[PDB]
Design a protein around this ligand. Structure first.
Ligand SMILES: [Ca+2]
Ligand SMILES: [Ca+2]
Ligand SMILES: [Zn+2]
Length: 845
RNA sequence: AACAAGCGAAUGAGUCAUUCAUCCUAAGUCUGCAU
RNA sequence: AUGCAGACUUAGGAUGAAUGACUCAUUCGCUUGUUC
């Protein structure tokens, strides 16, 4: 419901590329352009794609206008290079012929040329929007290839005017005729002739008896050359989102469908079909360049003014790209990284800014700085939500300038200006709304968690490219209340030098010979030592605040950099084992930091002594694990020594990590990743398909928890005891995982629900409560080319369920008839339940 | 890769609901103990 | 009053799983219309 939440889908607008904006539409005299060269080169060496030239009014940003992108076609891959060229001038005759080329081929293949009648006859320039006009036209191989453009412009004046075989345009040799571009005149769609039938004509068999009857009835047009061979020619299809590798290099080899037109209906174009094949690549290439242009525009808006700093447009691009956008990149890792950069920087800034606020009000002031609500506020105020690439990317909808837009989404979003203002009625809590789908004015539904993710992802993107300083610039550019004011960190040492160090028993020396750092101040490490039970003016609660953040950031920087192909949720699984406070307790004991936690609490002394007693020497070399948890003060010392390491070392994070990398020597790698037993238990029980009753209680001092798991014949009960009962659930789950890894008329079903998940919903909630394992389905389909109360379909799935009902013999049943696959399962569950009622197991009422 | 649509499926997401979890941080109440 | 402990709940960040339903993308089978 709140700003920054996932549930509030809020409508935002898209930003125009600002370099695709040309004012050169409707000049009187020829307009000058900056050119970029699209070199397409396939991995198959048998067929060539033509190189194109993008002709913008404005220069590109040298990171956009020199980029290589891979295009994943069907069963082949094309490298597209966007190397620059020179500034190219175009005369008005050249400018009209270039606009005719672009408008002709994009409208003839992707659009509908012959609207209704020829599109280029009726008035254009409505189709040349000034927000998006770029004039992309082939090159002869930095050249510009006026041969194909002149042929296309000549066939434009032709169609406005409307042994060798005869096209409507011109005659052609019968042999040098295959694989050439051709536009049919009676329905204006570009073809490309694969072959001419060797022994066929307009009289060939086609509810039409023949081809010439088909044209004489459908179009009413007398073929004045029936003798000549009608031509099989592959049609012009639509463009297909080459930017993502969807097939993963499923889709089977489909034959080309060819149309067969008499050559009189065809008009010859001297455009090669190298050009025609390259145009199918242009919607995805220009969508990628459009996106990189917005990314570099964001980079320019953010600036940096740093002498040694540069950030790619591809990394800004991935930082704005929500996962609703099927792509290779998806911002999710950068926004985990930027969550932790932001949390570090916010904690370090509040630590240094407020030397008197303790762990709680520092932590709450951080909750005000680092929230998704705060980052959503500072991102939408900064108008960074327009750069969000939260879109599926319909290439069918991609229209070049001059192309008609056969697929318009007319802006019924209620706002008539481009950029929406953040007001409610542009917020929606409901389902059925389509997140990502733009209208034609560029407005689309954004999850609003992804706006805050945008913020964090650009914090992380400037972190990767510029280190801490450029990420801190990105944060101040958003308006994050951080400044880092470096003498202020010196002022912290000037809150340390005034105190008289208390270096009494040379305790710090032994502690520093455990952590291999010198401590040029030594009161930071005394404060990181000092527990709140000593009742001093100082304590480690404030340095543990700082060190929670510096360790969460140093570890997720390690995890971001090492594991480059795994996203959040495995990085969060790994971070919740490195920054786990139990792990910090084992790291405190393993390096023996725990003998320097200075405290005056006897109950904390018996918690330390129980936890040192709980360590068991392992069965193989490994690591000495504990039996029980052991208190937070152990791990809080580890955090606070990291926090003292920052303020000691003038916030040098490479030094803080140079010290703390050998501390947790066995860093968790995702092979070595062992999740908490409860999580791993109910993930394994749900993935295999079983449930467990769970029961925890507080009998004596320490809590008890039993877990009755039901496998198919037995109910096996794993039970454990621990202080917290979340960890008694953890130990009962670990007991159950050991004794599971060795192995690896009374009930009321309640009312059957409807709305197509209802019966499987009720039987699943029933199997969880009255503990039976999940029913497994066996659907059966009889697909028919004839259609099948009912609404129509063509498969008629009749499904039978099984349920391995415990302490009974198993039961399979079936469903009458269902068009859907989900419904078949549903009706099979219903006929099962009524059958079960008859079998004296459950009562529906 | 003819095109649009509808229907069915498969796969990957996102989101909601349900009911459960993990990790870090703060806090409140209730219960217990003790100084 | 303070400390500790546990339950519960909330707030903040990062998340994950089963089930159910949408939605999207990609892909396939069919159907109709269109092209043929
Ligand atoms: Ca986030
Ligand atoms: Ca801690
Ligand atoms: Zn709109």
């Amino acid at each position: 419901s709140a700003a920054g939440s996932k549930k509030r889908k809020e409508l935002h607008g898209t930003t125009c590329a600002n370099a695709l904006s040309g004012t050169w539409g409707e000049n009187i005299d020829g307009a000058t352009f900056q050119a970029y060269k699209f070199d397409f080169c396939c991995n198959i060496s048998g067929e060539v794609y033509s190189s194109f030239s993008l002709l913008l009014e404005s220069t590109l940003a040298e990171d956009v206008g020199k980029v290589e992108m891979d295009l994943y076609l069907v069963r082949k891959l094309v490298k597209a290079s966007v190397s620059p060229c020179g500034q190219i001038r175009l005369s008005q005759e050249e400018l009209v012929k270039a606009k005719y080329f672009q408008q002709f081929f994009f409208n003839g293949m992707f659009g509908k040329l012959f609207v209704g009648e020829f599109l280029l006859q009726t008035d254009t320039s409505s189709l040349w929007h000034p927000a998006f006009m770029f004039l992309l036209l082939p090159v002869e191989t930095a050249t510009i290839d006026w041969s194909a453009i002149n042929s296309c412009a000549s066939i434009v004046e032709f169609l406005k005017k409307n042994n060798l075989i005869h096209f409507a345009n011109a005659s052609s040799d019968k042999n040098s005729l295959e694989e050439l571009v051709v536009i049919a005149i009676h329905t204006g769609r570009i073809y490309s002739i694969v072959e001419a039938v060797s022994d066929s004509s307009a009289m060939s068999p086609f509810g039409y008896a023949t081809y010439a009857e088909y044209f004489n009835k459908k179009y009413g047009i007398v073929l004045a050359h029936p003798n000549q061979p009608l031509m099989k020619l592959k049609q012009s299809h639509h463009a297909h989102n080459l930017l993502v590798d969807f097939n993963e290099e499923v889709r089977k080899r489909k034959p080309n469908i060819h149309a067969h037109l008499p050559p009189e209906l065809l008009a010859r174009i001297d455009v090669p079909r190298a050009v025609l094949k390259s145009i199918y690549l242009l919607p995805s290439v220009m969508h990628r360049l459009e996106s990189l242009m917005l990314a570099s525009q964001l980079r320019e808006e953010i600036d940096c003014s740093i002498d040694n700093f540069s950030i790619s447009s591809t990394s800004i691009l991935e930082a704005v790209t929500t996962l609703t956008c099927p792509e290779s990149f998806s911002m999710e890792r950068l926004e985990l990284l930027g969550d932790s950069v932001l949390k570090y920087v916010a904690s370090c800034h509040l630590f240094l800014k407020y030397p008197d606020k303790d762990e709680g009000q520092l932590s709450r002031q951080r909750q005000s700085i680092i929230s998704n609500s705060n980052l959503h506020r500072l991102t939408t105020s900064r108008k960074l939500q327009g750069y969000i690439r939260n879109g599926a990317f319909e290439p069918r909808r991609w229209t070049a300038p001059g192309q008609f837009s056969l697929f318009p989404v007319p802006c019924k979003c209620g706002i008539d200006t481009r950029e929406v203002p953040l007001d409610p009625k542009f917020f929606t809590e409901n389902m059925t709304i389509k997140i990502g789908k733009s209208c034609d004015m560029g407005h689309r539904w954004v999850v609003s968690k992804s706006v805050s993710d945008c913020a964090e992802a650009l914090i992380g993107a400037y972190y990767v490219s510029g280190g801490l300083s450029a990420s801190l610039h990105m944060m101040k550019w958003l308006g994050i209340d951080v400044d880092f004011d470096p003498n202020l960190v010196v002022e912290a040492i000037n809150r340390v030098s005034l105190r008289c160090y208390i270096p009494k028993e040379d305790e710090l020396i032994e502690l520093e010979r455990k952590i291999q750092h010198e401590f040029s101040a030594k009161f930071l490490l005394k404060e990181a030592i000092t527990h709140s039970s000593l009742r001093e003016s100082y304590s480690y609660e404030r340095l543990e605040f700082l060190g929670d953040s510096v360790l969460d950031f140093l570890i997720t920087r390690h995890l971001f950099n090492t594991y480059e192909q795994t996203g959040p949720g495995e990085m969060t699984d790994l971070r919740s084992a490195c920054v786990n406070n139990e792990n910090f307790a084992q790291v405190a004991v393993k390096n023996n930091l725990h003998t320097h936690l200075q405290r005056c609490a006897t109950v904390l002394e018996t918690q330390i002594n129980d936890y040192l007693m709980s360590f068991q020497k392992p069965d193989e070399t490994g690591r000495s694990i504990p039996s029980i948890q052991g208190p937070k003060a152990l791990g809080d010392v580890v955090e606070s020594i990291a926090g003292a390491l920052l303020i000691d070392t003038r916030l040098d994070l490479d030094q803080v990590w140079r010290v703390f990398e050998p501390l947790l020597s066995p860093l968790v790698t995702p092979d070595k990743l062992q999740l908490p037993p409860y999580r791993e238990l109910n993930e394994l029980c749900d993935s295999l398909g079983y449930f467990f009753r769970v029961k925890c209680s507080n009998d004596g001092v320490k809590a008890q928890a039993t877990i009755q798991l039901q496998l198919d014949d037995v109910l096996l009960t794993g039970d454990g005891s621990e202080q917290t009962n979340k960890l008694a659930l953890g130990k009962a789950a670990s007991h159950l995982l050991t004794q599971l890894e060795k192995r690896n008329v009374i009930p009321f079903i309640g009312p059957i629900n409807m709305k197509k998940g209802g019966p499987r919903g009720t039987l699943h909630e029933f199997c969880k409560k009255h503990l039976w394992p999940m029913p497994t389905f066996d659907t059966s389909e009889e697909k028919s080319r004839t259609p099948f109360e009912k609404r129509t379909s063509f498969s008629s799935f009749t499904s039978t369920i099984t349920l391995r009902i415990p302490n009974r013999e198993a039961v399979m049943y079936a469903g009458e008839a269902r068009p859907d696959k989900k419904s078949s399962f549903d009706s099979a569950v219903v006929e099962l339940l009524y059958e079960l009622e008859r079998r004296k197991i459950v009562i529906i009422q």
